[PDB]
Design a protein around this ligand. Structure first.
Ligand code: NA
Lengths: 154, 83, 260, 95, 184
RNA sequence: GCCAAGCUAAUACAUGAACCAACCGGGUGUCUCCGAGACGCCCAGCGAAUGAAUGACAAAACCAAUGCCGCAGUAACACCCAGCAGUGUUGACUCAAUUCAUUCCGUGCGAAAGCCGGCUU
């Protein structure tokens, strides 16, 4: 007669049970390896390059299989910065990079821009116009190759 | 019989050529085990186990060095703490 | 896939004339990289001048008359490289492959009890089956039980004749190194301070014997001794001392004037 | 050399009582059984001279269940005795 | 044949790419397995590099583990009860990864009595380690309720069309309650 | 471009080596002492699939059981081994590697059941 946990109706509306692969949440005697403040079992990872782990990653409840902090996605390659351009998708944003291009013949500059598709973890809530830091990862979709690592307000 | 020689029972064919001594042709025996090859087979198993024995000795030396280094730190800590 | 090598595409460290032929011998995979190796056919024929052509160079090699690291090699495409010992017992000459101050390959004469050891840089460490530690060196060797204090970047003194490691040199502040790549190849310096940039390359600052200051990537340095006084390996004549081109041009003009 | 105490193996504390070991082996000055080894005992002899090990029962007489082994421990009594008052001076250092 | 390249796709701008190279062997695909319940039948496939893949066509046996007790047993599959992709896979009775199946509960009941001495052991004898490990140990009612029924729900954890095996794990906790609500 | 019958090689194909020969672990039956020990039995190789752990941290009283002389010494460990791993790497890992359970092996794994010389084995 062991009373287990209950289904979290907030985060279970996807026709299949959302669960973290790295850990088993049905353990009667959890160890000290992966335990958050609430005493639950949650897998969290420490990425490199001196990036702090968000609080919602350590003591949250969301399930993301493409998050760089709570999944097997690793960060390697390039680190860039941009401004949020659109947040009309689900866990995806568009960032824009603006720069000046120098034309040698006329000795003058030229305004140019480029658009990138980035995966936004639920640990972050960026608004349009904010500045973000993104890091390169493996192909996560047809167009996505970067992951959000930090957000600067306004 | 299992011990009787077989080199003397091989079939020999005779070829005659005009103005030449007749020659006898016999097949070369295959799968014939000689005391030269019996020592060759048994030799292989000798250094197969010898090589494995050597690696176990190399493992023991490493564990001695690891443990002895770990032991010296305990004595140094206790020597200073007691004295 | 590829099997040939055009002469123009061959590395410039070798001395091959563009007007002599279309092709150059392509080294086989082995201990050293293709772009940082000297094939055995080039050493025998183009440097030692023992073989006039490549037909006579095959007679010498396929007889096993050339020993590399105390082992005969009969392939003219064998990739011999840095810190390698080449011995020909019939002629009684022993060499070591090093870099001169300019950057070219140099053959340094050796003696007995010195042609028995070589220095290897550790590039990787991992755990094998049965929980044994294995270290991979810069020339493909795999040591199955290294010193417990070994780390990546250190130098291991090996004994080719008897096949066990004898000593270990650690990589840190206050040590003698030789640069093996870049624009400062073959220069012997002294580690001053190393900048650590995670994810990117590390930069090491070195000072020469004369006091000249220079920098290079951390992967291009090779520890060879505690300091410039007691080196563990014989170096070429210039001792890794780079000189100005202005003065260099003057002495050769004077020496050649009095040469006759 | 030095002959004060002997080492007894492999007697087991959970199987043999205090009186049972005293019967086979005579320890006059001191006697103690060690549990971390669980096969070690330290008994001191008043007048061992050549000790009980050299005369006999070295490695052949065997004890109940297992063969017995003994040797010269090269430890005397008055050293560990002396440290006790040195340890008694700290037993009273704090109340 | 089948390809896995992006040359036939539209650009993000909606335009069309002009392909000027033929199809390469390095980007091929293969037809699926469509594994089903039944007597064992597999076929090997030679993959790139000379390796082999076991394309299973029918299976009826697998290895299922009780995570709470850290044990495992070889049992027989009884039915397919749920599939997240489409219930037409439940009708056709196909076996894929993460599908929900019902397995034989007899071997797990026997191990339960042999270990913890509970029957849902002719002579007690000196073996009384039952009380030694029965302390601080409880079994959820949901697992025990279906153990005595004869079958227990499980989740397939292996890819049958890539390795030729149907291995799984028994549902417990919140995952069990999630699927029991949909099935009703 | 082809068919049938009759001969016979292998480093082609197939099958297959017990004792010499160790260290260590898990589960279980009959004996002795008062929980300890002995014995018998099943399984314990490289690689593969699944599940569970490891893959670090960064001021005193009371009770039950324990180590040492009553709490001062104090790597750990119920004998043969009293230091025979308490310590993998990276910027970062669900990676390397180790232990337990089931299938393994139902894709695989010969000492080529191999060939030459020199000394007398
Ligand atoms: Na063969």
């Amino acid at each position: 007669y062991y009373h287990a946990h209950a289904v979290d109706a907030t985060i279970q509306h996807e026709k299949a049970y959302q669960r973290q692969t790295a850990v088993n949440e049905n353990m009667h005697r959890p160890s000290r390896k992966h335990v958050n403040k609430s005493g639950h079992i949650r897998y969290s990872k420490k990425i490199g390059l001196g990036f702090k782990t968000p609080a919602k990653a350590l003591n949250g409840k969301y399930i993301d299989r493409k998050c760089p902090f709570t999944s097997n996605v690793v960060i390697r390659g390039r680190i860039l910065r941009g401004v949020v351009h659109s947040t009309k998708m689900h866990r995806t944003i568009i960032i824009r990079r603006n720069y000046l291009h120098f034309i040698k013949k006329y000795q003058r500059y030229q305004k140019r821009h480029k658009s990138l598709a980035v995966h936004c973890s639920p640990a972050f809530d960026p608004k349009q116009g904010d500045e973000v830091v993104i890091g390169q990862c493996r192909p996560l979709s047809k167009t996505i190759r970067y992951n959000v690592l930090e957000v600067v307000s306004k | 019989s299992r011990t009787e020689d077989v080199r003397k029972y091989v079939v020999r064919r005779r070829v005659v050529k005009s103005g030449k001594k007749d020659r006898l042709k016999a097949p070369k025996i295959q799968r014939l085990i000689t005391p030269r090859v019996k020592a060759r087979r048994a030799k292989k198993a000798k250094d197969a186990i010898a090589k494995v024995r050597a690696s176990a000795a190399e493992r023991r030396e490493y564990l001695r060095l690891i443990a002895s280094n770990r032991r010296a730190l305990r004595q140094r800590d206790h020597s200073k703490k007691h004295t | 896939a590829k099997k040939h090598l055009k002469r123009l595409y061959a590395p410039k460290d070798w001395m091959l004339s563009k007007l002599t032929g279309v092709f150059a011998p392509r080294p086989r995979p082995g201990p050293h990289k293709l772009r940082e190796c000297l094939p055995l056919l080039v050493i025998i024929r183009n440097r030692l001048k023992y073989a006039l052509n490549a037909r006579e160079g095959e007679m010498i090699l396929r007889q096993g008359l050339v020993h590399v690291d105390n082992h005969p090699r009969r392939d003219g495409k064998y990739p011999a490289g840095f810190m390698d010992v080449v011995e020909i017992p019939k002629t009684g000459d022993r060499f070591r492959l090093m870099y001169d101050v300019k950057g070219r390959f140099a053959l340094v004469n050796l003696s007995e009890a010195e042609a028995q050891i070589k220095l290897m840089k550790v590039v990787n460490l991992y755990t094998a089956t049965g929980r044994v530690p294995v270290a991979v060196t810069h020339d493909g060797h795999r040591i199955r039980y290294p010193d417990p204090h070994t780390s990546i970047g250190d130098t291991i003194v090996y004994n080719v004749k008897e096949k066990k490691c004898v000593d270990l040199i650690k990589n840190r502040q206050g040590k003698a190194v030789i640069v093996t790549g870049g624009a400062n190849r073959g220069r012997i310096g002294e580690i001053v301070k190393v900048e650590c940039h995670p994810g990117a390359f590390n930069i090491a600052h070195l000072k020469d014997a004369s006091g000249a200051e220079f920098a290079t990537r951390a992967a291009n340095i090779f520890v060879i001794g505690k300091d410039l006084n007691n080196l563990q390996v014989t170096v070429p004549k210039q001792q890794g001392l780079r000189m100005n081109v202005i003065q260099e041009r003057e002495e050769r003009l004077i020496a050649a004037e009095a040469r006759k | 050399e030095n002959s004060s105490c002997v080492f007894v193996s492999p007697i087991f504390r959970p199987s043999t009582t205090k009186a049972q070991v005293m019967e086979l082996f005579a320890g006059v000055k001191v006697q103690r059984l060690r549990m971390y080894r669980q096969n070690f005992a330290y008994a001191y002899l008043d007048s061992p001279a050549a000790a009980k090990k050299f005369v006999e029962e070295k490695n052949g007489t065997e004890f109940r269940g297992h063969t017995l082994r003994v040797a010269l421990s090269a430890r005397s009594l008055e050293k560990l005795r002396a440290r006790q008052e040195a340890a008694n001076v700290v037993i009273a250092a704090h109340r | 044949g089948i390809v896995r390249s992006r040359l036939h796709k539209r650009k993000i701008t909606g335009g069309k790419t002009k392909i000027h190279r033929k199809r390469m062997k390095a980007e091929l695909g293969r037809l699926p397995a469509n594994t089903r319940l039944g007597a064992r039948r597999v076929s090997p496939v030679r993959a790139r590099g000379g390796n082999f893949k076991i394309r299973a066509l029918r299976l009826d046996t697998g290895n299922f583990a009780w995570a709470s007790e850290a044990i495992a047993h070889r049992v027989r599959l009884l039915d397919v009860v749920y599939n997240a992709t489409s219930n037409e896979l439940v009708r056709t009775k196909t076996l894929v990864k993460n599908c929900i199946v019902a397995v034989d509960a007899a071997p797990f009941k026997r191990w339960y009595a042999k270990h913890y001495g509970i029957d849902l052991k002719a002579s007690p004898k000196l073996q009384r380690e039952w009380t030694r490990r029965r302390r601080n140990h409880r079994v959820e009612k949901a697992i025990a309720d279906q153990l005595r029924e004869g079958r227990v729900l499980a989740r397939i954890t292996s890819r049958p069309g890539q390795s030729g095996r149907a291995d799984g794990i028994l549902l417990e906790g919140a995952e069990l309650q999630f699927y029991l609500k949909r099935l009703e």
